[PDB]
Amino acid sequence: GSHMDYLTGKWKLWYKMLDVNHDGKISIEDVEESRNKFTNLHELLEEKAKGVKVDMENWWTEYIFGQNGPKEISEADFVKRLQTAYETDKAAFVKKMENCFNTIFDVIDTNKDRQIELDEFVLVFKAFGHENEPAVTKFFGLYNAPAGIPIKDIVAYVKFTTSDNSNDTDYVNQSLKLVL
Ligand SMILES: [Ca+2]
Ligand SMILES: [Ca+2]
Known part of the structure; x- marks a missing residue:
């Protein structure tokens, strides 16, 4: 249904x-x-960097690939597995998406002040291959927290990955159509 069509678009955008x-x-x-x-890009030295690498890799294997999962994920396989999850238990799906972005935004939290500064946020995109710096910065401005968006903004990516409602003012869905 339309619940799913709007969600499928966000999930495909999140895949890219x-x-x-x-x-x-x-x-x-x-x-x-x-x-x-x-x-x-965070000027990390070898030990702290490898520890950050273990943290990033655990996030990928837990919330993207899934244990007992395939080695490679197409967009079709990605939307098929997210759709099946949403249809079987939506409440559990929302919780997993919460747990997902809680984990990654703590990695993005480099100074550990439990907020996402402008510098921490532009660099995770730059690390993930996305160099549209004016679009990441305008994305940051949408949340009215100039010096620090608190990490409970995983609720924004929870809306983006779980909400079935085309009417939402989704700043994530809006700005990722500009950054990428
Ligand atoms: Ca790839
Ligand atoms: Ca921070």
Whole structure:
């Protein structure tokens, strides 16, 4: 239904952000390119960087790939598995999406002040291959928190990945059509 058609569009858009190497699959080269450029661009040294790399890779294997999952994920396979999950238990699906973005936004939280500064936010996109800096910054401005968007803005990506309502004012859906 239309609930699903609007959601399918957001899920496909979210797939293109995750596919860092624009090859139509989610694979280990995506995990490696994103984690390597995240640590390098935060001026991290070898130990703290590898610890950040373990954290990034655990996020991918838990919330994207899934245990007992395929080695590579197409967009079709990605939307098929998210659709099946939403149809079987929506409440559980929302919780998993909450748990997902809670994990990643803590990685993005580099100073650990439990908020997402402008610098932390532009760099996760830059690490994930997205260099539209005026569009990331205008995206940041939409949340009226100039010096710090609190990490309970995973509720924005919860809306983006779980809401079935085409009427929502979704700043994530709006700005990712500009950044990527
Ligand atoms: Ca890829
Ligand atoms: Ca921070």
